[PDB]
Amino acid sequence: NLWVTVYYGVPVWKDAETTLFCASDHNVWATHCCVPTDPNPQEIHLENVTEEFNMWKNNMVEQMHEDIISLWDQSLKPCVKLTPLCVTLQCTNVTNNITDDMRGELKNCSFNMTTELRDKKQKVYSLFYRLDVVQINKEYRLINCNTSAITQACPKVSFEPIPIHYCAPAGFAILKCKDKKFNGTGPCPSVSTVQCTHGIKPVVSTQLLLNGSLAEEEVIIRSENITNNAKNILVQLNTPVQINCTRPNNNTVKSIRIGPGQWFYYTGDIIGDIRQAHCNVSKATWNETLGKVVKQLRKHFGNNTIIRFAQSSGGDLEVTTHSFNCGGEFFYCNTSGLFNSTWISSNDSITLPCRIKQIINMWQRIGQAMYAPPIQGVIRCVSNITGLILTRDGSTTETFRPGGGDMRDNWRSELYKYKVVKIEPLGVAPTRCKR
Amino acid sequence: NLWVTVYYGVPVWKDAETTLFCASDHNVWATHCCVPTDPNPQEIHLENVTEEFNMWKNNMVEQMHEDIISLWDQSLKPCVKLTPLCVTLQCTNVTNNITDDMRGELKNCSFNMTTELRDKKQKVYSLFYRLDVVQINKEYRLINCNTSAITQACPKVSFEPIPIHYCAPAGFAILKCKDKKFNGTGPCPSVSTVQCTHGIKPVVSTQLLLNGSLAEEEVIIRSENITNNAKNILVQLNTPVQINCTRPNNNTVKSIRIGPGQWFYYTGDIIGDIRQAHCNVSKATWNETLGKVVKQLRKHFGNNTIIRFAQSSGGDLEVTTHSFNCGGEFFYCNTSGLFNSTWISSNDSITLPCRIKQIINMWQRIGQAMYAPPIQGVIRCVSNITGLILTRDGSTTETFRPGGGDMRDNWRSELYKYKVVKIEPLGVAPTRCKR
Amino acid sequence: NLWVTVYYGVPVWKDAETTLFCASDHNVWATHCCVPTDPNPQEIHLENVTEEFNMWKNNMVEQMHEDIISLWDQSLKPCVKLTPLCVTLQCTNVTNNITDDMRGELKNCSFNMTTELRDKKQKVYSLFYRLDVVQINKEYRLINCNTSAITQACPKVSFEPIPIHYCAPAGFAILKCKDKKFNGTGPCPSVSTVQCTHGIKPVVSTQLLLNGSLAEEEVIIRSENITNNAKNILVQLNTPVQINCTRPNNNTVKSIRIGPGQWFYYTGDIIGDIRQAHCNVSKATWNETLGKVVKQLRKHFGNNTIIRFAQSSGGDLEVTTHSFNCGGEFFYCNTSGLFNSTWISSNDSITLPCRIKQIINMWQRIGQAMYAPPIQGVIRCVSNITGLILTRDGSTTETFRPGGGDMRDNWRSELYKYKVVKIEPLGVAPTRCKR
Amino acid sequence: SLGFLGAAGSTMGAASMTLTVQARNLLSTHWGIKQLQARVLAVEHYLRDQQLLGIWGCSGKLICCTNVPWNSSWSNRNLSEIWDNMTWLQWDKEISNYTQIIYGLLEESQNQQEKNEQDLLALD
Amino acid sequence: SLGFLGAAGSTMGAASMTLTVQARNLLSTHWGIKQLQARVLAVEHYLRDQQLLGIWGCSGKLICCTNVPWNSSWSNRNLSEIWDNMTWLQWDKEISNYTQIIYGLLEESQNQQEKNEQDLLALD
Amino acid sequence: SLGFLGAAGSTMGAASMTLTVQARNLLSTHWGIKQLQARVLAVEHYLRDQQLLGIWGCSGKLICCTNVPWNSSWSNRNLSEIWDNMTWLQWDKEISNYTQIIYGLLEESQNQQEKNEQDLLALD
Ligand SMILES: *[C@@H]1O[C@H](CO)[C@@H](O[C@@H]2O[C@H](CO)[C@@H](O)[C@H](O)[C@H]2NC(C)=O)[C@H](O)[C@H]1NC(C)=O
Ligand SMILES: *[C@@H]1O[C@H](CO)[C@@H](O[C@@H]2O[C@H](CO)[C@@H](O)[C@H](O)[C@H]2NC(C)=O)[C@H](O)[C@H]1NC(C)=O
Ligand SMILES: *[C@@H]1O[C@H](CO)[C@@H](O[C@@H]2O[C@H](CO)[C@@H](O)[C@H](O)[C@H]2NC(C)=O)[C@H](O)[C@H]1NC(C)=O
Ligand SMILES: *[C@@H]1O[C@H](CO)[C@@H](O[C@@H]2O[C@H](CO)[C@@H](O)[C@H](O)[C@H]2NC(C)=O)[C@H](O)[C@H]1NC(C)=O
Ligand SMILES: *[C@@H]1O[C@H](CO)[C@@H](O[C@@H]2O[C@H](CO)[C@@H](O)[C@H](O)[C@H]2NC(C)=O)[C@H](O)[C@H]1NC(C)=O
Ligand SMILES: *[C@@H]1O[C@H](CO)[C@@H](O[C@@H]2O[C@H](CO)[C@@H](O)[C@H](O)[C@H]2NC(C)=O)[C@H](O)[C@H]1NC(C)=O
Ligand SMILES: *[C@@H]1O[C@H](CO)[C@@H](O[C@@H]2O[C@H](CO)[C@@H](O)[C@H](O)[C@H]2NC(C)=O)[C@H](O)[C@H]1NC(C)=O
Ligand SMILES: *[C@@H]1O[C@H](CO)[C@@H](O[C@@H]2O[C@H](CO)[C@@H](O)[C@H](O)[C@H]2NC(C)=O)[C@H](O)[C@H]1NC(C)=O
Ligand SMILES: *[C@@H]1O[C@H](CO)[C@@H](O[C@@H]2O[C@H](CO)[C@@H](O)[C@H](O)[C@H]2NC(C)=O)[C@H](O)[C@H]1NC(C)=O
Ligand SMILES: *[C@@H]1O[C@H](CO)[C@@H](O[C@@H]2O[C@H](CO)[C@@H](O)[C@H](O)[C@H]2NC(C)=O)[C@H](O)[C@H]1NC(C)=O
Ligand SMILES: *[C@@H]1O[C@H](CO)[C@@H](O)[C@H](O)[C@H]1NC(C)=O
Ligand SMILES: *[C@@H]1O[C@H](CO)[C@@H](O)[C@H](O)[C@H]1NC(C)=O
Ligand SMILES: *[C@@H]1O[C@H](CO)[C@@H](O)[C@H](O)[C@H]1NC(C)=O
Ligand SMILES: *[C@@H]1O[C@H](CO)[C@@H](O)[C@H](O)[C@H]1NC(C)=O
Ligand SMILES: *[C@@H]1O[C@H](CO)[C@@H](O)[C@H](O)[C@H]1NC(C)=O
Ligand SMILES: *[C@@H]1O[C@H](CO)[C@@H](O)[C@H](O)[C@H]1NC(C)=O
């Protein structure tokens, strides 16, 4: 009666894991390695297609992680190795024009370094932050001396994130979820197909996500398992919170030759007096932001459940403070002033003190270290807080604390709406057609 | 009458050389980097097909040789360089608590090492085997100081051979010789087609072959041209000879940091009575084995010919003695006790007076040295002798000796059964079909 | 009443840029890296095909340039670094057997060099040619110490140019211009198709091109824009001018060990009188050659003008002076003896004095350097001048001076007959056939 | 006119009218390697589909009819249900367990068919 | 005779006599990447042209006569004026402006042909 | 069963019944460049053979008979011997010296056929 008819070019796909490539259009991410982005990328709406998405089981996130690590490391390959710098260092306190809150923050240190000629030595001095030196038992050493060689970042290279568009290879496609309020794990009733994702900026931070996407209408709370205290909660925002960060000191940068073709950069001195690095947010905006967060948490934890916010504690600065790169400098800000409230049913700012660190161990690895050269002058940046990383502790009161660690979650947030599938164009169906 | 007809998918092949790949199944062979194997899905017996095999003209052998070397070098690429050890050593004899079998074998040396801070030095003591230390004129240097750079092998990467299966690229097929009593160069009446070889353990040795396959029916003698005394003779055994090799001493391993992020491992002390490394072979089985070898040699040389076994000639330790990696340490053993007899027309065992070396220059390459970290504890290995490498002395008596050292031959021992051919799907034939 | 008919295998093409690969035919160009050339390449004459060529927009030149830089750098990758050599030197003049041609051009230096053992030092005496040594305040340093490290070239690797053939990939072809007297930018009425170019020797020189191809009948003058005073003029020749170059000094080469597995080579002494390096050309041949150049220049600038040849403008030795690699030695020769003449509408030689330099900064890059090992004995080579690089200074006497230093001008002097096109085999045309 | 996978969700008999729109999108420092491997992989998948169509005697057709009858054991629906209500994604899931069987039957059918033609051209 | 592109420059009529001459020449450390990148292009270009011919209903016959009529707006030269008085390079330069139109028409007529065959065979 | 080369050694007459099984078996750090090269080569060999089948007018079929007559100078043997007493390995040894000749003839024959088809269609 019926025969097997073969069709090719059939709109069928299966979930798949493949390799994606970057298309983007003096840079940490070596963007010249990517193809350029097509000025007229396409997107198509797929009416009546409902697909299951799972942001917590997504290999796009893992590839983004891998690419960022590799690109970051590759940019340090041609840079100076400051092995001549790991010497007994002789240090005293900077006590000249010190704000009370920086008493013994900054230190003055003396070295016997190598020079252009191997038979000579050059006596130099520089200023260091306390966070990067450890006492010898006036004798100090750099903190990386007992774990790794440190590479100086090349000064011409910018650390400012540039949006990277991820594109599927031929035969594959990326599905995108357009469903408002999608939490990342259920069926998505409204999808579209794209070849490339939007450009995603590889912004690196802890606790407070910066310069990401906003929700259209309401705060969306996403988690792998909300009742599991071992999982993080990613909260997006439907409004930005403006944050103004500064390093309010006019630093004068000096450099020396340490060997043929190699030079070391350091802070020589500071012009004028000093002030503690800090970040400002508006108190009122922050209070509205939390009010929205609390309402959504109550939907999940109970209408009459008390929601409390608290500072996090335990671990290194990367998981207790808000770290970020501002002006190319590395900041560690105390967010306790933001997360200190209990909720039952005009230029007033919140000021968060911050510290500055130059020896940076990224991606929670050991054995690698980078020396961040100082930046001349005074640093300011303004950024938008577009989501929070919270963890729940553990009756009556639920306590949430800022979370952090595992960079996969920052990327997971931007990629929550994308899925990779493979096209299977060949298939069969019964018809009345024979031979 | 007849016309040309073209057939595609024709069961023919031609001898060809192509690139094979690793399918494998913390190792120096990067076994995690190979596509894994399937559970030996099949071999296809080919009825009425006789192919010519030639183990002496085999590119599988040459590729394995090159791949093993490349993997070896890669495994040292990220490991600590030991350049700072090439200093004058101050050495005295270790004659404390010895048996006098070891008199002169160990020396207690002291030297000034670099440390985490480059402006500090730290005097250390360590024990060395005499084979790795050469007198300068009490003042000694490491043997490799005037020829090569030395890299420490990573303490977490094992030298235990893992069977590696070699698989044909698509479009090619590996033919295997199934016939018994096949001597490596003639036609093989019974063959089969496989996609992957069995896994081969890349065991490194000389004089005797360890952990290979056994012959099932008789001892088989294989050589390219047996009448040419310039060729080696490979002998495959029917029964394994079990050999036990040990290092009776209990060594204590110490670790010194020699620069940021790096450390050197060295024997700190020895707990107890210093004794000679040694290895045991039972006489009953060894004497039976030689008799079997002689019978086969008599088939080639005459019944009326006397066969003598003799020890090796002088030369580099690597080629005059048996050599293997046991527990991570490299042993050199005098096999003379196994080849000292003339053959004419109880647990009593043979003990081999073995010695240990840590500085390794494998594949006979000059300029590339490796340091073998010491092993904590006492070392014991049990292995099977599955074959021999013999040389022929250049009237009425023939003499054979335990020669060797060219690693290519160890691989010939297992790859003799395989040949790689290209599949050639097109061909034509006459027939009665026209159009 | 016609229909579209599709034809595949249509002999048409488009200008295109693709990747070309090398085919060759102990050497710095690593010709073993290239695919060996088939002994019988074909050339297919295209009757009735006129194509436009533009040597100044020919990206084959850019690829050749990149391959040359790449091969050059790869050849130095495994060679000994001389960082231990950048030490204060104590230097006096070599006045011991001077003919006054070399007075002030050779110095005797001594320094404290490292040894295999890192705790020992050796005092080394060596000779330098002044251009490589600069004063610090008898205290000198090598010129590269404040720019970069210098790598010693491997003594076993020759720098002699080997013709390198370039080949297009399938789908592409190279069209060659066969017309005589072709200036590189207009239509070429007679062309042929090849898959591979002839082998081109990558001869590196400034001002006077050596060992290239000759013009078929007459001197051909080619330039990007003849009236643009910022552009170079490439003058080919229809006859070679023989040039005989030498370093007439018997150099004794000495070497020292500088570290484990490494050694440094330097000139130990000179036997016999010390004389200046030089190059000879025939005065008569050179004067005839210029007369031909002058006539062709008059065709472009008027036949009622004056052409005057003059000296280079000054600046860096590598640009202002003629340079070449002879025997592996690096020569810098003064051409003022060649370009000193005003042209108005028996065994008499011209001797050009030369300087020798061992520290070479190639390809106009900054941050890399090579040390050229000394060459044992006396160096002599004979080569052909096959073209000139001239510049013109902006009813007046025109002034021409030697130009160059931009290596693309040398390649472009051979790659002017070739262009790469993409084959576009598919197309359509109308006919009476329909289905 | 939609584009690429935009037909998904339409009925099977609607989607089947636009096959070329998707067929055209097939084939259209390891950052070098990732890009190169992706190109190779795209080719390999393309070629496997084309080889398979070739074996079945459907080379170059998009829509190809065969001599293999449909089994009610693979699926049993009215043709109007299959072509007018269901879409291709649903269908692929429903008969995902029979694709190996069907492909084997198609390969056997074509092999016999070729032999029969070879004999007819030799005049039996 | 006149291997590879040797017939280039001859008129279109004569050049069409050697289509297989050019067709058969199609496809035919850090450094090893320049060959892999070249080989992959030769293959991708080959396959894209083959795919296009397949979509158009030309499985690969070298010369495929289609059912799409020629428009005078593309070219109004008579046939001798095209086939006897021009070479292929000249022809391509003139027709280039309309080739996307032509290619679209060819894909469209083939889809109509495929549907018609399938329906006739349901009636057969 | 007899997968891959299992039919080898059987006579040509029997072996022709297994062409399909060997058709589907075609086309399937610094270490990757070895696997990647192997993948590329498999594709290149596959495509070159398909290219010849296309040129000769066989294309997607496994068995094609053509209009080229068999020449006794290539081989003078009775059909009862070649198709029942010689194997495809033995035959290759015997016919190898003439396969370049045969391939050239197959190409020319198809070109003549294509010209004839174009002309017949033009004549309607
Ligand atoms: C730099 O200032 C710090 C204070 O910020 C001094 O450290 C304190 O020393 C007293 C003993 O005299 C201890 O009891 C405190 O606990 C220390 N405080 C901290 C934060 O370490 C330090 O001695 C000063 N150093 C110099 C060179 O003046
Ligand atoms: C996101 O929304 C989905 C609903 O679309 C929620 O999924 C349900 O979770 C419960 C509890 O595990 C299951 O019993 C249901 O079967 C799930 N429904 C579906 C359609 O999958 C999910 O829990 C929500 N997650 C968050 C963080 O809000
Ligand atoms: C260290 O050991 C060496 C042996 O390795 C001793 O030297 C030997 O001394 C005997 C005399 O008792 C000589 O006959 C040998 O020829 C010597 N051999 C070598 C290699 O020199 C040496 O005396 C011992 N030194 C100490 C301090 O114990
Ligand atoms: C392994 O067996 C083969 C036989 O298959 C031996 O090869 C023959 O040796 C004779 C010696 O004169 C030659 O004339 C023949 O041409 C060889 N070929 C064959 C197929 O017989 C081979 O010599 C044997 N190997 C050893 C080590 O004895
Ligand atoms: C090598 O060691 C093995 C044991 O590790 C010895 O084999 C054993 O011998 C003992 C008697 O001494 C038996 O009781 C064991 O049963 C044997 N092995 C087993 C467990 O089967 C072997 O004899 C040693 N080889 C030599 C020659 O020393
Ligand atoms: C090495 O030779 C240079 C010249 O090549 C000497 O320097 C010159 O000395 C004369 C006087 O005899 C002055 O008129 C020149 O102006 C000097 N030239 C320069 C560049 O300074 C130099 O003194 C000699 N050094 C030694 C150690 O003999
Ligand atoms: C090289 O020769 C070509 C002719 O083959 C010259 O091209 C002419 O240049 C003038 C001035 O720009 C134009 O007006 C003509 O139309 C060009 N003719 C053609 C056929 O293109 C070119 O100028 C010569 N180059 C040099 C440096 O003299
Ligand atoms: C999504 O499904 C709806 C049906 O629920 C499709 O709309 C129907 O389309 C047919 C054919 O044109 C019409 O005869 C019906 O009257 C339409 N029904 C309704 C309720 O509008 C719609 O086309 C589907 N979407 C896609 C992309 O195929
Ligand atoms: C190049 O053009 C010439 C014409 O200028 C072609 O020669 C003509 O060929 C036709 C066809 O065989 C003859 O009828 C004419 O009499 C020939 N003319 C002359 C002057 O000989 C020539 O064939 C063309 N070249 C190519 C490769 O096609
Ligand atoms: C190998 O040769 C034997 C003959 O010696 C083949 O055996 C015959 O096979 C046919 C089937 O094709 C049977 O009808 C005959 O009765 C068999 N002969 C005997 C004596 O039993 C065998 O098939 C051949 N192997 C292959 C793979 O073709
Ligand atoms: C530099 O070296 C001198 C000895 O020459 C020593 O006294 C001084 O403390 C050293 N200074 C530093 C900063 O290491
Ligand atoms: C910094 O300290 C100096 C004294 O060392 C003082 O003269 C100067 O005014 C101070 N600067 C500021 C901005 O307080
Ligand atoms: C319960 O939650 C709803 C919102 O879902 C809110 O409108 C209502 O007032 C809450 N009731 C209380 C206060 O428990
Ligand atoms: C270590 O350095 C000191 C420096 O005073 C020297 O006297 C001693 O001999 C050195 N020891 C060794 C074992 O090199
Ligand atoms: C070598 O070092 C010594 C000091 O140890 C110094 O006196 C001598 O001048 C140095 N030699 C040279 C050539 O600089
Ligand atoms: C057969 O082959 C011979 C050469 O071996 C050739 O001379 C003859 O013309 C050919 N005949 C046919 C009909 O092809």
Side-chain angles (χ1 to χ4, degrees), chain A residues 12 47 54 65 80-81 109 114 119 153 165 183 200 202 212 215 224 254-256 312 331 334 374 388 393:
Chain A
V12 173
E47 187 169 351
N54 188 336
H65 181 80
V80 173
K81 302 294 187 287
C109 300
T114 62
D119 61 285
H165 295 75
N183 66 13
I200 297 170
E224 184 178 355
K254 301 292 185 182
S255 65
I256 61 173
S312 67
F331 283 62
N334 185 348
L388 311 175
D393 204 335

Short mmCIF file of all heavy atoms in Angstrom, two decimals, chain A residues 12 47 54 65 80-81 109 114 119 153 165 183 200 202 212 215 224 254-256 312 331 334 374 388 393:
data_model
loop_
_atom_site.label_atom_id
_atom_site.label_comp_id
_atom_site.label_asym_id
_atom_site.label_seq_id
_atom_site.Cartn_x
_atom_site.Cartn_y
_atom_site.Cartn_z
N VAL A 12 14.92 18.78 10.99
CA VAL A 12 15.11 17.98 12.18
C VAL A 12 16.47 18.13 12.78
O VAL A 12 17.47 18.21 12.06
CB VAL A 12 14.83 16.50 11.88
CG1 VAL A 12 15.20 15.60 13.05
CG2 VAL A 12 13.36 16.36 11.66
N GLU A 47 8.09 29.41 14.81
CA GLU A 47 6.78 29.38 15.40
C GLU A 47 6.39 27.93 15.62
O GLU A 47 6.75 27.09 14.82
CB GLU A 47 5.79 30.16 14.56
CG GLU A 47 4.44 30.32 15.17
CD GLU A 47 3.61 31.28 14.45
OE1 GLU A 47 4.12 31.96 13.59
OE2 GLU A 47 2.44 31.35 14.74
N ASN A 54 18.66 23.66 29.08
CA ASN A 54 19.19 23.44 30.41
C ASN A 54 20.50 24.16 30.57
O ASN A 54 21.54 23.68 30.15
CB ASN A 54 19.33 21.97 30.69
CG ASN A 54 19.69 21.69 32.10
OD1 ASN A 54 20.28 22.51 32.84
ND2 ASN A 54 19.34 20.51 32.53
N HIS A 65 34.65 28.88 28.82
CA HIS A 65 35.63 28.87 29.87
C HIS A 65 36.98 28.49 29.31
O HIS A 65 37.95 29.21 29.53
CB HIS A 65 35.23 27.87 30.96
CG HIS A 65 36.13 27.78 32.12
ND1 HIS A 65 36.12 28.69 33.14
CD2 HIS A 65 37.08 26.90 32.43
CE1 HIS A 65 37.02 28.36 34.03
NE2 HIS A 65 37.62 27.28 33.62
N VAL A 80 57.74 39.61 29.72
CA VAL A 80 58.87 39.51 30.64
C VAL A 80 58.65 38.64 31.87
O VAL A 80 57.66 38.79 32.57
CB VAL A 80 59.21 40.93 31.13
CG1 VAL A 80 60.25 40.92 32.22
CG2 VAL A 80 59.70 41.74 29.98
N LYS A 81 59.61 37.76 32.15
CA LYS A 81 59.51 36.91 33.32
C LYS A 81 60.29 37.56 34.43
O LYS A 81 61.51 37.69 34.33
CB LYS A 81 60.07 35.52 33.05
CG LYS A 81 59.40 34.80 31.90
CD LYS A 81 57.95 34.47 32.21
CE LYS A 81 57.30 33.59 31.14
NZ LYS A 81 57.02 34.33 29.89
N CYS A 109 59.68 49.51 49.60
CA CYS A 109 60.63 48.39 49.53
C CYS A 109 61.87 48.63 48.65
O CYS A 109 61.80 49.23 47.57
CB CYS A 109 59.87 47.16 49.07
SG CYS A 109 58.46 46.63 50.18
N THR A 114 69.02 42.86 38.78
CA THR A 114 69.93 42.68 37.68
C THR A 114 69.76 43.80 36.69
O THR A 114 68.83 44.61 36.80
CB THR A 114 69.66 41.34 37.01
OG1 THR A 114 68.33 41.33 36.48
CG2 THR A 114 69.79 40.24 38.05
N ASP A 119 77.28 41.48 34.71
CA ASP A 119 78.17 41.66 35.84
C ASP A 119 77.72 42.78 36.78
O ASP A 119 78.31 42.96 37.85
CB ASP A 119 79.61 41.89 35.38
CG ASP A 119 79.81 43.12 34.53
OD1 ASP A 119 79.44 43.12 33.35
OD2 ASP A 119 80.32 44.09 35.05
N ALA A 153 52.53 41.49 32.86
CA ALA A 153 51.67 41.68 31.71
C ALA A 153 52.32 42.71 30.82
O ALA A 153 52.87 43.68 31.34
CB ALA A 153 50.29 42.14 32.14
N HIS A 165 31.42 37.17 19.61
CA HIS A 165 30.26 36.43 19.13
C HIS A 165 30.65 34.98 18.89
O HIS A 165 31.65 34.71 18.23
CB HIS A 165 29.77 37.04 17.81
CG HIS A 165 29.22 38.44 17.90
ND1 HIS A 165 30.03 39.54 18.04
CD2 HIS A 165 27.96 38.92 17.81
CE1 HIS A 165 29.30 40.63 18.05
NE2 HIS A 165 28.04 40.28 17.93
N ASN A 183 13.72 30.68 33.26
CA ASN A 183 14.63 30.44 34.38
C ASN A 183 15.83 29.54 34.03
O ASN A 183 16.64 29.23 34.90
CB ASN A 183 13.84 29.86 35.57
CG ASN A 183 13.22 28.45 35.32
OD1 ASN A 183 13.56 27.74 34.34
ND2 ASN A 183 12.33 28.04 36.23
N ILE A 200 29.29 38.49 23.51
CA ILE A 200 29.32 38.40 24.95
C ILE A 200 30.60 38.95 25.50
O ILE A 200 31.67 38.57 25.05
CB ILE A 200 29.09 36.96 25.41
CG1 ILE A 200 27.69 36.54 24.96
CG2 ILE A 200 29.27 36.83 26.92
CD1 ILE A 200 27.35 35.09 25.09
N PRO A 202 33.49 39.13 28.02
CA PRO A 202 34.10 38.32 29.03
C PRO A 202 34.52 39.16 30.22
O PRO A 202 35.71 39.38 30.44
CB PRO A 202 35.29 37.73 28.30
CG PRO A 202 35.66 38.78 27.33
CD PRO A 202 34.35 39.38 26.87
N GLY A 212 26.35 42.99 32.08
CA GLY A 212 25.66 41.87 31.44
C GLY A 212 24.32 42.30 30.91
O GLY A 212 24.03 43.49 30.78
N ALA A 215 17.04 41.78 32.42
CA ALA A 215 15.76 41.16 32.19
C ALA A 215 14.83 42.23 31.66
O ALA A 215 14.99 43.40 31.99
CB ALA A 215 15.23 40.56 33.48
N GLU A 224 20.28 25.63 39.82
CA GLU A 224 20.17 24.23 39.39
C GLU A 224 19.14 23.43 40.19
O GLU A 224 18.37 22.65 39.63
CB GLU A 224 21.53 23.55 39.47
CG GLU A 224 21.54 22.12 38.97
CD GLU A 224 22.90 21.50 39.03
OE1 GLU A 224 23.84 22.19 39.36
OE2 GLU A 224 23.01 20.32 38.77
N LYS A 254 57.54 54.42 37.25
CA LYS A 254 58.94 54.36 36.90
C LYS A 254 59.27 53.02 36.28
O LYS A 254 58.58 52.03 36.53
CB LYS A 254 59.79 54.53 38.14
CG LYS A 254 59.58 55.81 38.90
CD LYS A 254 60.05 57.03 38.15
CE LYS A 254 59.94 58.27 39.03
NZ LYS A 254 60.34 59.51 38.31
N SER A 255 60.34 52.95 35.51
CA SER A 255 60.75 51.66 34.98
C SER A 255 62.25 51.53 34.91
O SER A 255 62.98 52.52 34.81
CB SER A 255 60.18 51.46 33.61
OG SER A 255 60.72 52.38 32.71
N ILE A 256 62.70 50.29 34.97
CA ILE A 256 64.12 49.97 34.86
C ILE A 256 64.39 48.86 33.88
O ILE A 256 63.52 48.02 33.63
CB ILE A 256 64.67 49.58 36.23
CG1 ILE A 256 63.90 48.34 36.73
CG2 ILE A 256 64.59 50.76 37.17
CD1 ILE A 256 64.41 47.72 37.98
N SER A 312 29.40 37.64 53.24
CA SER A 312 29.95 36.31 53.17
C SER A 312 31.19 36.24 54.01
O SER A 312 31.77 37.27 54.35
CB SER A 312 30.24 35.93 51.75
OG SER A 312 31.27 36.70 51.23
N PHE A 331 40.94 45.43 41.60
CA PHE A 331 40.22 45.83 42.81
C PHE A 331 39.59 44.69 43.57
O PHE A 331 39.07 43.76 42.96
CB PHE A 331 39.07 46.75 42.45
CG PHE A 331 39.38 48.14 42.13
CD1 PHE A 331 40.17 48.51 41.08
CD2 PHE A 331 38.80 49.13 42.89
CE1 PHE A 331 40.40 49.84 40.82
CE2 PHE A 331 39.01 50.44 42.63
CZ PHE A 331 39.81 50.79 41.60
N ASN A 334 34.82 45.49 49.51
CA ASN A 334 34.03 44.90 50.59
C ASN A 334 32.55 45.29 50.45
O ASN A 334 32.17 46.44 50.71
CB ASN A 334 34.60 45.32 51.95
CG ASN A 334 33.92 44.67 53.19
OD1 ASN A 334 32.84 44.04 53.09
ND2 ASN A 334 34.54 44.84 54.37
N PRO A 374 51.58 48.94 37.21
CA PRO A 374 50.89 50.06 37.77
C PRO A 374 50.43 50.94 36.66
O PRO A 374 51.03 50.97 35.58
CB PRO A 374 51.94 50.75 38.57
CG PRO A 374 53.19 50.40 37.85
CD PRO A 374 53.01 49.00 37.38
N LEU A 388 23.26 39.26 40.48
CA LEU A 388 23.92 38.88 41.71
C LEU A 388 24.21 37.39 41.80
O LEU A 388 23.44 36.57 41.29
CB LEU A 388 22.99 39.20 42.87
CG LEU A 388 22.37 40.62 42.90
CD1 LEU A 388 21.40 40.68 44.05
CD2 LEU A 388 23.39 41.66 43.02
N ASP A 393 22.30 29.87 53.03
CA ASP A 393 22.90 29.19 54.16
C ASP A 393 21.91 28.16 54.72
O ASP A 393 20.80 28.05 54.21
CB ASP A 393 23.28 30.29 55.19
CG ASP A 393 24.39 29.91 56.17
OD1 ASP A 393 24.57 28.73 56.40
OD2 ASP A 393 25.06 30.80 56.68
#
